[PDB]
Amino acid sequence: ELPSLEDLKVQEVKVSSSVLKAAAHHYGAQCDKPNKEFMLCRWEEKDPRRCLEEGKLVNQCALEFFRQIKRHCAEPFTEYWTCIDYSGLQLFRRCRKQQAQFDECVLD
Amino acid sequence: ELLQVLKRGLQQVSGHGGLRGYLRVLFRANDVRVGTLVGEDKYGNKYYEDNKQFFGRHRWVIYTTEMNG
Amino acid sequence: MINILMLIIPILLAVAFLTLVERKVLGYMQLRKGPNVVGPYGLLQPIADAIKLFIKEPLRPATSSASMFILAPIMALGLALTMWIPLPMPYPLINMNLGVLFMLAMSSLAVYSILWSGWASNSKYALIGALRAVAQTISYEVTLAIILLSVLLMSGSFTLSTLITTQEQMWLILPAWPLAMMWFISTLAETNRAPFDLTEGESELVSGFNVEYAAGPFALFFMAEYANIIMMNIFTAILFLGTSHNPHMPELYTINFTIKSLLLTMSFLWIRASYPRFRYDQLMHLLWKNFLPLTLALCMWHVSLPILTSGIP
Amino acid sequence: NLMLALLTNFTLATLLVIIAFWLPQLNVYSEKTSPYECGFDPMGSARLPFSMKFFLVAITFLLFDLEIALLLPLPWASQTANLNTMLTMALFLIILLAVSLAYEWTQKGLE
Amino acid sequence: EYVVAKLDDLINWARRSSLWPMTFGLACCAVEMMHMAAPRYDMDRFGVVFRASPRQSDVMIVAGTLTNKMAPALRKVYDQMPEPRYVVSMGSCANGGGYYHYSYSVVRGCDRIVPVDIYVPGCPPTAEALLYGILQLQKKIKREKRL
Amino acid sequence: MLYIVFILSVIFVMGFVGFSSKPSPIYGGLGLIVSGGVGCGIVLNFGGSFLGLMVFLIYLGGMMVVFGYTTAMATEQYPEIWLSNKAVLGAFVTGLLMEFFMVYYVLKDKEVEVVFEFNGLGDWVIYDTGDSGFFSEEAMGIAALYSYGTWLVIVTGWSLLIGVVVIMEIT
Amino acid sequence: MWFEVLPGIAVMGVCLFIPGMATARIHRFSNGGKEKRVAHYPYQWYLMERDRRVSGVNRSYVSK
Amino acid sequence: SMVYMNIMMAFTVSLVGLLMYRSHLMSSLLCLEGMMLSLFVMAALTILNSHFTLASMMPIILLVFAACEAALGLSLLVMVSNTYGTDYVQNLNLL
Amino acid sequence: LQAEKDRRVLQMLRENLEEEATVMKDXXXXXXXXXXXXXXXXXXXXXXXXXXXXXXXXXXXXXXXXXXX
Amino acid sequence: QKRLGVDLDRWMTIQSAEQPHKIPSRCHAFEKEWIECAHGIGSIRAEKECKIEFEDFRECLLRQKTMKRLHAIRRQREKLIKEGKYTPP
Amino acid sequence: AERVAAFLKNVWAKEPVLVASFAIAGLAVILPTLSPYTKYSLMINXXXXXXXXXXXXXXXXXXXXXXXXXXXXXXXXXXX
Ligand SMILES: NC(=O)c1ccc[n+]([C@@H]2O[C@H](COP(=O)([O-])OP(=O)(O)OC[C@H]3O[C@@H](n4cnc5c(N)ncnc54)[C@H](OP(=O)(O)O)[C@@H]3O)[C@@H](O)[C@H]2O)c1
Numbered sequence A: 001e002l003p004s005l006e007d008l009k010v011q012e013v014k015v016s017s018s019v020l021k022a023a024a025h026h027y028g029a030q031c032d033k034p035n036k037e038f039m040l041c042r043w044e045e046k047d048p049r050r051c052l053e054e055g056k057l058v059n060q061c062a063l064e065f066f067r068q069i070k071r072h073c074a075e076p077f078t079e080y081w082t083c084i085d086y087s088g089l090q091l092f093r094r095c096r097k098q099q100a101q102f103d104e105c106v107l108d
Numbered sequence B: 001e002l003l004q005v006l007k008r009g010l011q012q013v014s015g016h017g018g019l020r021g022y023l024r025v026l027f028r029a030n031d032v033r034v035g036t037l038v039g040e041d042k043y044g045n046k047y048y049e050d051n052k053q054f055f056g057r058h059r060w061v062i063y064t065t066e067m068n069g
Numbered sequence C: 001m002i003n004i005l006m007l008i009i010p011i012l013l014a015v016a017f018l019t020l021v022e023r024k025v026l027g028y029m030q031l032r033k034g035p036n037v038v039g040p041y042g043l044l045q046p047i048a049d050a051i052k053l054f055i056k057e058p059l060r061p062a063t064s065s066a067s068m069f070i071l072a073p074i075m076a077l078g079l080a081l082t083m084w085i086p087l088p089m090p091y092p093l094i095n096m097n098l099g100v101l102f103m104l105a106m107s108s109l110a111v112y113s114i115l116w117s118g119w120a121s122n123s124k125y126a127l128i129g130a131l132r133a134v135a136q137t138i139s140y141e142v143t144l145a146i147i148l149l150s151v152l153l154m155s156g157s158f159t160l161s162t163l164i165t166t167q168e169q170m171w172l173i174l175p176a177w178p179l180a181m182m183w184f185i186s187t188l189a190e191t192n193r194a195p196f197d198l199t200e201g202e203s204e205l206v207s208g209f210n211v212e213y214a215a216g217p218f219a220l221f222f223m224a225e226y227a228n229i230i231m232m233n234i235f236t237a238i239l240f241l242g243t244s245h246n247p248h249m250p251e252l253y254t255i256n257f258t259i260k261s262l263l264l265t266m267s268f269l270w271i272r273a274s275y276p277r278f279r280y281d282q283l284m285h286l287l288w289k290n291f292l293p294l295t296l297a298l299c300m301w302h303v304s305l306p307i308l309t310s311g312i313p
Numbered sequence D: 001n002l003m004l005a006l007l008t009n010f011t012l013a014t015l016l017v018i019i020a021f022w023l024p025q026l027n028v029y030s031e032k033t034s035p036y037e038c039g040f041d042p043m044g045s046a047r048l049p050f051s052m053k054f055f056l057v058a059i060t061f062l063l064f065d066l067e068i069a070l071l072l073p074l075p076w077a078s079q080t081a082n083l084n085t086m087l088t089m090a091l092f093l094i095i096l097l098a099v100s101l102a103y104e105w106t107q108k109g110l111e
Numbered sequence E: 001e002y003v004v005a006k007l008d009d010l011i012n013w014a015r016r017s018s019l020w021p022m023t024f025g026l027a028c029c030a031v032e033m034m035h036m037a038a039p040r041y042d043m044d045r046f047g048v049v050f051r052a053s054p055r056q057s058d059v060m061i062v063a064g065t066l067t068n069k070m071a072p073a074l075r076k077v078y079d080q081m082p083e084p085r086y087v088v089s090m091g092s093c094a095n096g097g098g099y100y101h102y103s104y105s106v107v108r109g110c111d112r113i114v115p116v117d118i119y120v121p122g123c124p125p126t127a128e129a130l131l132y133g134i135l136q137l138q139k140k141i142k143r144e145k146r147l
Numbered sequence F: 001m002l003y004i005v006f007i008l009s010v011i012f013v014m015g016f017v018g019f020s021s022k023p024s025p026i027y028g029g030l031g032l033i034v035s036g037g038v039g040c041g042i043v044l045n046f047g048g049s050f051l052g053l054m055v056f057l058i059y060l061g062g063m064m065v066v067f068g069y070t071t072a073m074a075t076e077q078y079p080e081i082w083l084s085n086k087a088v089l090g091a092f093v094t095g096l097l098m099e100f101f102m103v104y105y106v107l108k109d110k111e112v113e114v115v116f117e118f119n120g121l122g123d124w125v126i127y128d129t130g131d132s133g134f135f136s137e138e139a140m141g142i143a144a145l146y147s148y149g150t151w152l153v154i155v156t157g158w159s160l161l162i163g164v165v166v167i168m169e170i171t
Numbered sequence G: 001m002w003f004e005v006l007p008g009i010a011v012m013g014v015c016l017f018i019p020g021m022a023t024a025r026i027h028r029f030s031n032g033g034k035e036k037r038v039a040h041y042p043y044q045w046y047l048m049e050r051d052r053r054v055s056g057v058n059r060s061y062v063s064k
Numbered sequence H: 001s002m003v004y005m006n007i008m009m010a011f012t013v014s015l016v017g018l019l020m021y022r023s024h025l026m027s028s029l030l031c032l033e034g035m036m037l038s039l040f041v042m043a044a045l046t047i048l049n050s051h052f053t054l055a056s057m058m059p060i061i062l063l064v065f066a067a068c069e070a071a072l073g074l075s076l077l078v079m080v081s082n083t084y085g086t087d088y089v090q091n092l093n094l095l
Numbered sequence I: 001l002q003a004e005k006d007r008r009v010l011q012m013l014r015e016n017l018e019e020e021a022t023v024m025k026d027x028x029x030x031x032x033x034x035x036x037x038x039x040x041x042x043x044x045x046x047x048x049x050x051x052x053x054x055x056x057x058x059x060x061x062x063x064x065x066x067x068x069x
Numbered sequence J: 001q002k003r004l005g006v007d008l009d010r011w012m013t014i015q016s017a018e019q020p021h022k023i024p025s026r027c028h029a030f031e032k033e034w035i036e037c038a039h040g041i042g043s044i045r046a047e048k049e050c051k052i053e054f055e056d057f058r059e060c061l062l063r064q065k066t067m068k069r070l071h072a073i074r075r076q077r078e079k080l081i082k083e084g085k086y087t088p089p
Numbered sequence K: 001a002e003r004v005a006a007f008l009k010n011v012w013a014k015e016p017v018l019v020a021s022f023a024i025a026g027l028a029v030i031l032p033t034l035s036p037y038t039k040y041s042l043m044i045n046x047x048x049x050x051x052x053x054x055x056x057x058x059x060x061x062x063x064x065x066x067x068x069x070x071x072x073x074x075x076x077x078x079x080x
């Protein structure tokens, strides 16, 4: 069958917690070029074994995305993150008042 | 109108007995009401009267505890 | 799991404390004093019936049947008390993939309690009260699903969680004006304490699912039959009432939800005292002949509305 | 769990029957009767057909209940598919049900 | 010792609390038996709830005249009652014929058919006097099960 | 404990024996509730709450119509218990040997079957479906549709018109 | 009089009040943050499964 | 594969049930809905495992037609009792 | 979606090590080429093959409609 | 069909068609091969050329080829008791 | 009037619920064809994506850009 290497792709992969990813839809706008090329590779060639090299760049850019938010305007990001987990899965409902504190700091 | 209705209930509990007296007229007695009393009766009956309320009614009256044996 | 056990024992008490309201409100409706002697306002009498009917009352039927009969009060409680689980509330016990489908299926399964009580006595006297209970329920199951569909297409999907969020500004009584009036009648499909009702009360015929049963099974039937009345009252307060949601404070929802349901809880006992029984034949003529063309015309109307003006979840 | 939620309610319900079954016991005489409710000896022993009266109206329910089940897509299906193509088909099932009930008006039955 | 003695009174408290009557529409006594449901003299949820059906009820009130045509009918109804049962024969007909007694059809005193615990003597049984028929019933229930 | 559907499938066949071994349409009527209701759980565990609870809506409602002819027409003579008759119990005792003796071969190794296919164990393989879809998930998640099968809507509408008119001619 | 009726309503304002509060206030002990996650469809189910897998280990739903 | 073998075994018992007749005619109409119940479970598992989405509409159509025959046969049961007294497989005139 | 494929690859490598450990002496199992005769598309189908051992992890992964937390 | 439909079509019958919304079949990878092999008349009538692709299609829905393979692994793990045991998980 | 006004009041007198069964159900067919708002509801129904977006290879294409906020294809802007 020929399986992938035991070393695996992307060192220290994925974020530590869920919902955190769902709270920020800005990942669609920023860093899309590595994401879309992996997407274009995967639909044309259905094998995960062939387009894992492009998938390495997706996870590497994912770590670069979260580190920028942790450096500048971290306190409005944490307050928005605690708001979404307090409720069930409203995603954008009720937390729109605390969403005003967010984005405005990021706009700087 | 609403203030006088709540005050009428509080005055009824304050007039007859007090704290321990009101509980005796609630747990043992079915309906609690205060007014005029005749007083004098054999064994120890209370016998209350002179109340308006409704037609064919002459207050609580009440039964005595341990009448003969 | 603790939540299920905290939804049977306090709920059985609500069916117990119903017996007060069943003759206190109904009493003042008939200008007579209800519970008074037993407790401070007769409050010790509802809990006294549990000591009265179970511990001391012993009957089992004569000619009887085999395993069935005693199977029926198990079917009475074990299908009507399970109805509390899919309820949305502030927060539901295991939120269903589709909400109202489980509510409609188990309600029709709860009808079997009065059905298996027909074969409780092999004698023909009991099954007349069962055969009457068939038609007084079988016809009203048609509209119960149709009037639901007109409300469900108006707001969200089958999920009961979405039905709370859809009512943020105004109630669903005002858009569904003739449909809300239908759910004072269609709710009384199950054998409930009402004027429309079914073959359960005495009045003219012998008492259905009571003449065959004892005290102990017969006592278990009332703990299920009156339980369905609260269930329909809550279910109307979800589909037609709402007022506010508030996910942050559950305290503001729990008080406001109970008042809306309690006003409806009085309303069925208001119906019970006021009006006579509709007769076996003529209840089949209220619906089917007269109300079914009306509900389907409104069902036709509620199909067009999301297409006319955008209304898709 | 759905299984643990349903069984705990069912086991508590059947346990309450046992409490009312074993505690009250003293004597069981040949006293219990077949019909009860009104009294006297049962003239109609065991079982007899009776039947009729509602035979047509009951049958129609079995026929109608399938259509209401086929109406259940309406709030759940109309999300991805085109509305203009659906409008002609969704109403079509409701229209024909009124036609069947219109044929039910010309002699409904004994009920 | 003390818990056992008080538990027997707790079971007897349930019969002291509530007892469901039977609507024996037997004679004129049954009309005054309907006056127990009438508001002016009420036992409605004071300790009495009308529901009928001999299988569910605890107390049966024989309300009037019994005949030889009715002697087999009432007997098995008493047998259809749960074992803790009380019979209140209300009226002179229930106690041995109002007049009658020396008549051909009327059975004398109900006690020939079914045993009675509490007697009410009143022809037109005044609702005032009828109230004892349930209040004395509760007072008579004192002790059950010693061993 | 690992098996969820397999234990329910035993109860499914259990109610089905009370059909070949005729127990009258009251004890045999119970089968459509007992094995029918558990039969919904077989559908529910695989997925799709709609089609799983769709069995509850008709096979209980339509059974009430059947119940409208259990206390009617023919069967009202004797209850006829499946534990009393010698001709009935003989079919049940051989009926249980068609089910319970089969489970004896399931435990340890693959079970012996009349068909060519082997049963094996299959605990994790019982689901045999990956996650794949997320938003608007499940094939049963968007099951019923008026689109694509437009011809199927017309004939179903026709067949439910025919019956109402036809039964009127019979009666 | 309503002074007899209102204790019949007030006793219902305690027993029927329980199932609402008992479901909500139990989320403090069961989960960290007084919330039980809604499942519905596999998308929301997968988010819970990866949360329990990622450094929460034993806990089903946990922040960070 | 594994789950299919149990519901196929339930089909065979209901197959015999439609071919076995004793006294009443009511057993057949239970088995008609019984056999359709066993086919419905078989259809539900086959379509959902190897996902179809389009063909998951098909058992819903099948479930409609499942009681289409059952309603007509149950209405035919009514008219036999009117001509005779009680519906019996044992009681027939035609040769 | 990458997180799905990251887990599926790691599960495959765990299965490859288990097959080599169990089969060594008498039994014939190559594991190469796999079951499919096509060997060009190579479908994942990690539901029946995924997790060969440990009951607690397998039961949670298989059931989603059941329990539904 | 004894008589076929012209102009108007009432298809949506065969596997791997235009999906209900967008969701594809679980066996869609093997479904595509069967249409590509049997589009010509002299393939299914011959039933020899498409024998390779039909056997791969049998593996998808029934999973019988994978069932007997996974049965051998689970049996050997149960057979080896108290002698040679490994548990990486 | 022969049947427009003369026969309509006869339905109101005997069995008046029959009037509502024809009028409300009748308007449910006429309104979705003539009213100029029905086409807007289908537009949002097609715009709402259920499945994930698919990337296509670009080789001389018009109205196609990056995922970032730019004028590409069409993009829904019908009422806010
Ligand atoms: N098996 C038979 O049928 C059989 C065969 C051969 C001979 N016999 C003879 O026939 C007689 C049948 O009588 P039985 O057994 O039918 O009577 P039983 O049912 O035992 O009834 C006797 C009653 O007397 C009371 N009693 C007796 N001893 C008591 C004590 N020490 N303290 C308080 N109360 C007491 C009991 O009241 P409590 O329940 O309130 O204590 C009980 O209700 C026997 O005496 C026997 O010699 C019987």
Ligand code: SF4
Binding pocket: E027, E028, E029, E030, E063, E064, E065, E090, E091, E092, E093, E094, E098, E122, E123, E124, E125
């Ligand atoms: S005792 Fe008097 S009132 Fe009672 S039934 Fe006899 S005659 Fe009538």
